[PDB]
Amino acid sequence: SLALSLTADQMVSALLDAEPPILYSEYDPTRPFSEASMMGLLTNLADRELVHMINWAKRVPGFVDLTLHDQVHLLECAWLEILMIGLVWRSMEHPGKLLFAPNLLLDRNQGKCVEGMVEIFDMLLATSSRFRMMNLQGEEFVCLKSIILLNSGVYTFLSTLKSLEEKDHIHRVLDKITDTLIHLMAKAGLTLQQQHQRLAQLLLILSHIRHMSNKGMEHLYSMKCKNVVPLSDLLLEMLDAHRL
């Protein structure tokens, strides 16, 4: 496994190179939003982002070392968290707005076009504000996103046996990413005390991201039953994995 032998700088480079592209929406800017239109645009975008996410995961060091079943499990658990942290990152320099795509920049009030959406918008906007307040760096962002992939479902398997090799390996890779974060902070000139404080601040945001994903999954589930929008088979499978 190359993963455990990578240096801090090598980890960052791998993660920066693995980054998925920023997609555009098919959004026609000349036509007003309806609840159906907006949800159609957002679900369409989520579906396309998911396909790129799957390729990105394969490039996260240590991920392909896992069984196909464990890979599926991690992605099923973390997919909406991963979409969300990406969205929050994109929107960081757009106070009060969410940059779903360069041509789909929605502000706080437009979440109202969809039932129960505004509450989620608000949580996402508060996260981007936090990122802005901390001056989150792109190198830290990619580390945080990989941590979400490896961490979120890691306790929902290791479950023996004897696939404790899976769990221990994942935790070793997680330690390497922690090392990478601290390396970036030291390189940025933070004192030891400031490094530890900032690490904790960053990781505590992951708790809020988990919360948002769970609320998001309930919203998506209610959108399915309200048949407000037809959902792709991939999206439906990722949703069903959370068996709400």
Partner: peptide, 9 residues
């Protein structure tokens, strides 16, 4: 599953 198929492509 679709995800299972994409992880093999």
């Amino acid at each position: 599953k679709i995800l299972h198929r994409l992880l093999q492509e």
